[PDB]
Structure formats: structure tokens, C-alpha cells
Design a protein around this nucleic acid. Structure first.
Length: 75
RNA sequence: UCAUGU
């Protein structure tokens, strides 16, 4: 996998804690990026984000598609 | 329980 962007801001569309993934909409391109629970930095759902939350992340591209990495609060 | 849940 390769890093294709860093310090991207986005808004969480939805995140399902049962299945452990969701999608973030990038504020710069308006495209959704997949986010898995393991990509979220520790905040008891130790790795989760909330629907509607603004987050900052890197985008990396394995060939299942573009996915978020190192997901944190803005700044 | 790793690609659009409900």
C-alpha cells in the first residue's frame, strides 16, 4: 500500500461499531474513503469515530480502494 | 467484525 495524501480533513458519514468500519467523506474532493477501526488512533470502543465528526487522516491506496489511515481529530 | 451497515 502507498500513501497518496496526508493531513486530509473529512467528515464521518457513518461508522458501524458492530462490523468495525465506515466511510469518511473527504472535504477536498468530496469522495468517500473507507475507514476500518484499526486505522483510528486511540481515543470502551477504543477505536471508533462518530457520525458527523470532522477528522484528519492520511489516505492510502491498497487495491481494494482508497482508505483512511492514522485517523485523528483535526490538528 | 475489512468496501456503502441501518
Amino acid at each position: 500500500k502507498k500513501v497518496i495524501a496526508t493531513k486530509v480533513l473529512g467528515t464521518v458519514k457513518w461508522f458501524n461499531v458492530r462490523n468495525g468500519y465506515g466511510f469518511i467523506n473527504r472535504n477536498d474532493t468530496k469522495e468517500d474513503v473507507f475507514v476500518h477501526q484499526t486505522a483510528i488512533k486511540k481515543n470502551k470502543y477504543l477505536r471508533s469515530v462518530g457520525d458527523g465528526e470532522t477528522v484528519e487522516f492520511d489516505v492510502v491506496e491498497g487495491e481494494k480502494g482508497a482508505e483512511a489511515a492514522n485517523v485523528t481529530g483535526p490538528g
